[PDB]
Design an enzyme around this catalytic site. Structure first.
Site, PDB file in Angstrom:
ATOM      1  CG  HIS A   1      21.947  36.221  39.778  1.00 41.06           C
ATOM      2  ND1 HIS A   1      20.619  35.463  39.970  1.00 41.06           N
ATOM      3  CD2 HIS A   1      21.994  36.598  38.479  1.00 41.06           C
ATOM      4  CE1 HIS A   1      20.022  35.973  38.805  1.00 41.06           C
ATOM      5  NE2 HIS A   1      20.831  36.527  37.788  1.00 41.06           N
TER       6      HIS A   1
ATOM      7  CG  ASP B   1      19.402  40.163  33.842  1.00 36.69           C
ATOM      8  OD1 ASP B   1      19.366  39.002  33.230  1.00 36.69           O
ATOM      9  OD2 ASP B   1      20.365  40.589  34.334  1.00 36.69           O
TER      10      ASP B   1
HETATM   11  N1  LIG Z   1      23.149  29.412  28.269  1.00 38.12           N
HETATM   12  C1  LIG Z   1      23.131  28.880  29.651  1.00 38.12           C
HETATM   13  C2  LIG Z   1      23.436  28.372  30.409  1.00 38.12           C
HETATM   14  C3  LIG Z   1      23.311  28.479  31.616  1.00 38.12           C
HETATM   15  N2  LIG Z   1      24.380  29.510  32.403  1.00 38.12           N
HETATM   16  C4  LIG Z   1      24.217  30.397  34.025  1.00 38.12           C
HETATM   17  C5  LIG Z   1      25.401  31.368  33.565  1.00 38.12           C
HETATM   18  C6  LIG Z   1      24.760  32.596  34.657  1.00 38.12           C
HETATM   19  C7  LIG Z   1      24.661  34.177  34.855  1.00 38.12           C
HETATM   20  C8  LIG Z   1      24.712  35.058  35.121  1.00 38.12           C
HETATM   21  C9  LIG Z   1      23.826  36.599  34.936  1.00 38.12           C
HETATM   22  O1  LIG Z   1      23.830  36.268  33.304  1.00 38.12           O
HETATM   23  C10 LIG Z   1      24.797  37.109  35.646  1.00 38.12           C
HETATM   24  S1  LIG Z   1      22.834  38.375  35.194  1.00 38.12           S
HETATM   25  K   LIG Z   2      15.152  39.115  36.325  1.00 34.99           K
HETATM   26 ZN   LIG Z   3      21.456  37.958  33.507  1.00 39.94          ZN
END
Ligand SMILES: NCCCNCCCCCC(=O)CS
Ligand SMILES: [K+]
Ligand SMILES: [Zn+2]
Ligand SMILES: [K+]
Length: 620
Positions: free
Chosen positions: A137, A174
């Protein structure tokens, strides 16, 4: 000439936490790293991989994918007090900064680069790097979604610069769209980025229109960015496998990448509080396995997400298991992908059809055993063995008196029995190969003795233009035939592929192997795969990939029968059964008469075998 698997891990990357209260970040805890390594230690996997020390990525290696202004911004974090890091992280979306996070982020980057060096220098065959924080990300000048530096984006640029690699395949399984990877390689055709992710029509984080299947790539890189948006939660194993068979694998083999890099995030598994999918951890043992024949096995798995401590460990071990070559678990309950997945698969196949023409549609201890002819002896690797018993010869005498002759074919069937019992009992050996004699009496004695092993279901793959050696009706046997004469397929429990001889033979065989044979065999869930090849080559080019991909069924238990001793093809069969790395096929256009024949076979079969469907079914 390369062996082993690298496990890069360090306890120091679990020494940064979220300090303040932040419900979005609370799932990203250092325990993710300890539970994953401890699960590998408990199952004897970590001890089986070549450990590689973690280094820091240099300033110039980080500047490959980031800017000096943003690196200098992060470089000043270790001097900040809790009030100052809370403000620095509010400048970004869903990320927290720790006093030690800059240190560990450079370790996560360096650990990844050290995995590429190990794999590209042929020091190991493949590898996994348990790292923290994740990467996919983060972008050129932003820390986004738990990630500080884009580890996988470093690896690709690193391998591009230091190894002169022209084609790299990044797979991001992912549940979040790795937009930092897509941004960096957007206009870049050298790195093929694929990513499925939870989308729910842009309502899910990070809520990007670029996450949609419409985003294909800008400039000269158009066609090398593939997004597969999941629009409903609860995606099961059949949804993930259909995505591979009908989207990712056809494009990958066409791409023929020189290095496969995996953004392995395991929040795409059952029980994850963020992805809310329903895929079992065992599906990851097959995800990695289906990518092994690419880049001659050179696969670098890098940890991304995964936040269910129990569900995370189980999938990490399933990944390492297949990285080491361990037998993949049988998967059952497979069928049609859900209507939302079939819609998303249908849309992405269409938008990408202009770049990958295979998507066009018409308008509407010892692992293997080798028994060769008597007297001969060949150089067989460290997973193989040669031959008999009186308990089995009493059997062989019974088959002759009941159903059939006097010759040393009795020794071929007597050895067929001995390995078959060694495969289904004891777990003494896994697969096996028998250079064989008379075809009809051999396949009949092999299968009939296999069903009484017992073998619930038996998949039979036969390459040759012969007559059906055994029948198929009772729903316990499925047969695949490769031939030259069209058999006018009648029964649903069969699949006859009639090819036209030419330079397009291997390219068409691969399209039928990934689009038809693999989806049927996975839904079938066989107890044993029985491969037979007629002595009547083009198989030599492709048989290696066939024997390796089909081992995802039946826990690897495959018995291969070769008529007529071909030293090159026999050595190729044994090498692929042994788990050795498979040579690439190179870059890839089948004849229109071939794809017309296969979609004719798909429509004929996709009702019973739903895993063949790559379009949402037109309801009556
Ligand atoms: N219930 C859903 C709420 C959304 N939350 C976003 C949190 C960012 C997670 C980033 C991640 O997983 C890296 S792979
Ligand atoms: K992905
Ligand atoms: Zn993730
Ligand atoms: K790209």
């Amino acid at each position: 000439a390369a062996s082993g698997s690298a496990l890069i891990f360090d306890e120091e990357m679990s020494r940064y936490k979220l300090l303040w209260t932040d419900p979005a970040c609370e799932i990203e805890v250092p325990e993710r790293l300890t539970v994953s390594y401890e699960a590998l230690r408990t199952h004897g996997l970590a001890q089986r991989c070549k450990a590689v020390p973690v280094r820091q990525a240099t300033e110039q290696e980080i500047l490959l994918a980031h800017s000096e202004e943003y690196l200098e911004a992060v470089k000043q974090t270790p001097g900040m007090n809790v009030e100052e890091l809370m403000a620095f992280s509010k400048k970004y979306n869903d990320v927290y900064f720790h006093q030690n996070i800059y240190h560990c982020a450079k370790l996560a980057a360096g650990a990844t680069l050290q995995l590429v060096d190990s794999v590209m220098k042929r020091e190991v065959r493949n590898g996994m790097a348990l790292v923290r924080p994740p990467g996919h990300h983060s972008q050129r000048s932003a820390a986004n979604g738990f990630c500080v530096f884009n580890n996988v984006a470093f690896a690709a640029l690193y391998a591009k610069k230091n190894y002169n690699l022209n084609r790299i395949l990044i797979v991001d399984w992912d549940v979040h769209h790795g937009q930092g990877i897509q941004y960096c390689f957007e206009e870049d055709p050298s790195v093929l980025y694929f990513s499925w992710h939870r989308y729910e029509h842009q309502s899910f984080w990070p809520n990007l229109p670029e996450s949609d299947y419409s985003s294909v790539g800008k400039g000269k890189g158009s066609g090398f960015n593939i997004n597969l948006p999941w629009n409903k939660v609860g995606m099961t194993n059949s949804d993930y496998l259909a995505a591979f068979f009908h989207v990712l694998l056809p494009v990958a083999y066409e791409f023929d990448p020189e290095l496969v890099i995996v953004s392995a995030g395991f929040d795409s598994a059952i029980g994850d509080p963020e992805g809310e999918m329903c895929a079992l951890p065992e599906i990851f043992a097959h995800l990695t396995h289906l990518l092994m024949p690419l880049a001659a096995g050179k696969m670098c798995v890098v940890l991304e997400g995964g936040y269910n401590l129990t569900s995370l460990g189980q999938s990490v071990c399933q990944t390492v298991h297949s990285l080491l070559g361990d037998p993949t678990p049988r998967i059952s309950g497979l069928g049609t992908a859900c209507d939302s997945a079939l819609e998303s698969i249908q849309n992405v196949r269409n938008v990408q059809s202009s770049y990958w023409s295979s998507f066009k549609h018409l308008a509407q201890s010892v692992r293997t055993v080798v028994v060769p002819p008597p007297g001969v002896e060949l150089t067989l690797p460290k997973n193989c063995q040669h031959s008999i018993s009186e308990s089995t010869a009493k059997e062989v005498q019974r088959i002759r008196d009941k159903h059939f002759t006097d010759q040393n074919i009795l020794r071929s069937l007597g050895n067929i029995i001995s390995v078959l019992d060694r495969m289904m009992r004891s777990d003494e050996v896994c697969n096996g190969c028998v250079v064989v004699s008379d075809l009809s009496v051999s396949v009949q004695c092999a299968l009939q003795h296999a069903l009484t092993e017992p073998a619930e279901r038996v998949l039979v793959v036969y390459v040759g233009d012969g007559e059906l050696p055994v029948k198929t009706n009772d729903g316990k046997v499925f047969l695949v035939q490769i031939c030259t004469k069209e058999t006018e397929d009648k029964c649903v429990n069969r699949l006859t592929l009639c090819l036209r001889e030419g330079e397009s033979l291997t390219a068409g065989f691969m399209q039928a192997l990934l689009g038809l044979i693999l989806p049927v065999a996975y839904e079938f869930n066989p107890a044993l795969v029985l491969g037979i090849v007629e002595e009547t080559t083009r198989l030599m080019r492709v048989w290696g990939h066939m024997t390796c991909l089909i081992q995802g069924l039946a826990r690897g238990r495959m018995l291969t029968l070769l008529q007529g001793y071909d030293k090159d093809l026999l050595e190729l069969t044994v090498s692929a059964l042994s788990g050795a790395s498979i040579s690439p096929l190179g870059p890839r256009a089948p004849k229109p008469e071939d794809v017309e024949m296969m979609e004719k076979q798909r429509q004929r079969l996709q009702e019973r075998w739903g895993l063949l469907r790559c379009t949402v079914s037109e309801s009556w």
